[model samples]
Target chain A: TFSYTLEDHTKQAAGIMNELRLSQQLCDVTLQVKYQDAPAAQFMAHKVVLASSSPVFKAMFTNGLREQGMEVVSIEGIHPKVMERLIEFAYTASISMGEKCVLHVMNGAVMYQIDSVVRACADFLVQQL
Target chain B: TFSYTLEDHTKQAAGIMNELRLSQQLCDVTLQVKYQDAPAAQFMAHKVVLASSSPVFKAMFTNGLREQGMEVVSIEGIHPKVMERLIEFAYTASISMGEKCVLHVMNGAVMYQIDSVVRACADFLVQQL
Candidate 1:
């Protein structure tokens, strides 16, 4: 799994994927992952993460990461501040945590934490904290 | 309608979705229905596909699919490849696959498929066969 940070200016986050070359199935997956943050602002500082078994997908994304100037990190975890802010935003936005929107973030973050530590943290937080 | 390819480093495919969930509302639909590739890497891969009959908002995407790393696939109906990537990236990193983004992908793919499916298929055959 891998992740990247992108600018949220005008949906270019979604555009980068569209400009690449992959199968239609993979492209669909890419687009869905790209725009998962549109609920809050039309534009803002944002991050993107992904998890897949397709070597093709990985190769393409590596190039994308460099193209976008994003730093690669282990899918091992995310900052607690980030998760907290995400939850707060979901609540403020009146969006359901299990809903499609929130699900994207949850899933995306977990992918970043390839070992599922982030997910476990989130789950523990959701259940215990 | 349009699409692109990306990398599949670990689970970075889902990473972009995480960074972009702040704007989750911008996109009415987005998600992945693939593999986290492992139990520990078992981040839930959501089958996020949306169809809201809205025009002001017509986007779809997964948040962290990019930053982490991963390739994207565009099926016959995928199209937001270049939605708000420009403006959103210009500002923040959080994301969404807004209606406009969806419309962009849908329409672009629609047009691209309409005009390029044959060529695409031929390329596919040539590349494979």
Candidate 2:
């Protein structure tokens, strides 16, 4: 049995994102995440990917709401740039949870109920703090 | 620290492909792989990605391949479908390596010299044999 290292798997994980870019996914919805006060600033994403990554989105898409069928679903109060980061995370299973980003990153993770991101963000913060 | 498991890494690895679909990748080459004598079937891929995955391809693309500059590259003596499988494996790190497929699968893995796939093929064959 060859002992595969975590680093090997991590490299593969990171590379997987390079292989499957956002343009390649079967993008079902023109998802628009918004700022609470600013309608103009919205981060765009896809429903199937978000649904796959987060249980919150999974339920939202499947629980028989008009939200599922809407060409664009508006998520409120998420920072556009920060929301952009999370959309990348949903498809890539990776994100930057740095000191600058983790505050809103964690909130978005919680809102989406993405356990991995929430834990990764909190752990990164725990170390920095 | 909230400890993560190998499964976490694996899930993340698999999910990466979902985010970056083949359409998402910036594909440059139109690769045509052929059997010993068939005239027209083709398999296509990108130079940057294939070069990134395998050392052989890395050298081929970077070290002045007249092939690299060309829009279409013709590869000799590989089954078209199996070649297709490797492209998917390269991007997604997942392939259908059943009994019928394993022969060409392992052959493709060897050609690219991807160590993980080589070991995975060996371990799987060991189980079957």
Candidate 3:
């Protein structure tokens, strides 16, 4: 009797992320984001996906917070435009960031506790200096 | 303006997979698996996760097939026990396969078209000979 193990899941992540990109089908929640005094922007996603990506989201959705079981979640401090990219990053784990919006992306990553994005954005900012 | 990209998404995949293992909360579908006419075992998962991992799942969920929007999906020919490992593998992108179950796992992998699992299982089978 012999056994074997393989230790990378890059493909599995890409598959679900593709679903998020392709149709946003069967998504269970909406993020209503507010930046400054402007109108809010709404983003659609799976609760499981978001909870897994961010402890903050996990807490909000599972810990009896008002957001729990809520269909639309309200977010502050992140712009709708930047949130778009952040949501994309959450799904794909990769994003194109430049001087234009890297800081905002970093801010959102920090607030959401998406450590990978935070680290990547920080690295990008450091390299730019 | 400079742009930077990070190609690997191992962390993101891990986060969601962790959720799958933890509580299976927010799961949208249940898989009923059977083999040799034994009673089926049920497994919970997100449709997006499964659809992304297998084109067969993608077509089933998106193409108006009977399984589309289905709360429970029936999968035959694979044993419930092997499916437990397969679903675990699907979420985590890794599994422990021994002489007893490697072939069964490989069959499930091939049937689902999860290329990574299929490839890894094939490699394991080859080395054992």
Top candidate (lDDT): 3
lDDT of 1 by residue, A55-121 (tens): 2223444332223323332222333333433322211211123322334445544543433333433
Every model's DockQ? 0.05, 0.06, 0.36
CAPRI verdict on model 2?
incorrect
List chain B TM-scores, each candidate: 0.19, 0.71, 0.79
The local distance difference test score of each candidate is 0.29, 0.58, 0.70
Off by over 4 Å in 2: A1-10, A13-129, B1-25, B64-70, B127-129
- Candidate 3 TM-score over all chains jointly: 0.79
lDDT of 2 at B128: 75
Q: Write the per-residue lDDT of candidate 3 for residues B1-129, one digit (tens) a residue.
A: 544445555555555655754575666678888778788788887766666666777667664332322377888888898888777666666567667788888898888887887887788779777
Off by over 4 Å in 3: A1-8, A37-40, A63-70, A120-129, B2-9, B37-39, B63-70, B124-129
lDDT of 1 at A15: 39
Interface RMSD after interface superposition, each candidate: 17.8, 10.9, 4.8
> In model 3, which residue pairs have backbone atoms overlapping below 3 Å?
none
Query: What is the per-residue lDDT of model 1 for residues B1-129, given as tens digits with 9 covering 90 to 100?
Result: 111122222124334443334333112223222323421211112122111111112233333353322323332333224333312322233233443343343343333332222233233336444
